[PDB]
Amino acid sequence: DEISMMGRVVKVEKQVQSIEHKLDLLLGFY
Amino acid sequence: DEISMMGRVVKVEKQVQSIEHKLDLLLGFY
């Protein structure tokens, strides 16, 4: 099921953005 | 093979959650 698949890809993308922002906090990038 | 593909996406999602939790530990978010 391609919608299920796309759903998981979109979820991963959002988590990945949130991860990058958290590292920007540790690094002092803003 | 779409099951193989979905399998890898699900695996990536779980690793990504585990990564976000580990950074929450470094950041002091709980």
Added chain:
Amino acid sequence: DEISMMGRVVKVEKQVQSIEHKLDLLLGFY
């Protein structure tokens, strides 16, 4: 839509590379 899907996968890949480079900065790998 497979192009939309591929688009999101490529985006995730680029964010993931950028994340790995940022951690290389925290770790002192260069």
Added chain:
Amino acid sequence: DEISMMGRVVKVEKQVQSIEHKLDLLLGFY
């Protein structure tokens, strides 16, 4: 193209494992 797609997913998975190991280094998990 599904092979191209699977190729990128596998690449992301490998980068994600490498990212988790790097954080294990910052956290002192071994």
